[PDB]
């Protein structure tokens with residue numbers, strides 16, 4: 001099982017999700033979430049964007065993907081919760097800090113990269129606070145079914161997103177403990193669940 005095989009698997013999974021969401025069509029956002037990831041995985045499957053950094057290999061399309069798709073996931077959750085256009089700005093700003101810090105830390109060869117990782121971790125804790133607190137208060141004002149859908153997507157999001165920084169740190173970008181193949185396999189699984197699984201839970205409730 002090679003890296004390219006794993007990338008193709010993620011590509012296929014994102015494509016199936018993309019077509020499913022487009023057919024059922026919120027729906028436009030889900031198409032963007034999995035559609036963008038599909039492209040990133042194909043590019044990586046073709047061997048494009050594999051950037052050598054010191055002694056590790058960094059996958060640049062992954063971070064462009066995350067920077068564009070994760071704010072769309074937060075946007076989807078913000079619509080469910082009924083956020084005013086100002087609350088959107090805070091959470092999307094916090095999200096972008098996490099994503100940019102990870103992208104920069106991955107691309108820096110020296111230990112300064114752990115300083116960038118730490119900053120993303122701090123901003124992530126602030127993002128979790130807004131999901132579990134203010135956004136949950138806001139979602140409470142909606143129908144019982146909308147509130148229930150928000151809570152289920154929120155917990156899926158919070159629990160799984162919290163695993164990514166550990167995979168990053170244990171993988172090549174960090175202490176380089178986990179091997180690239182295992183690290184990639186774990187992230188392909190998480191990407192598929194936080195995007196396509198996310199989407200199908202929304203379809204089921206609709």
Ligand SMILES: *C/C=C(C)/C=C/C=C(C)/C=C/C1=C(C)CCCC1(C)C
Nearest residue numbers: 102117120121124161164165168194
């Ligand atoms: C579809 C892709 C998803 C949902 C990716 C999520 C990624 C994260 C939640 C990553 C978080 C990180 C930290 C909290 C600190 C810095 C390193 C990151 C980017 C792995």
Ligand SMILES: [Cl-]
Nearest residue numbers: 058059106173
């Ligand atoms: Cl990476």
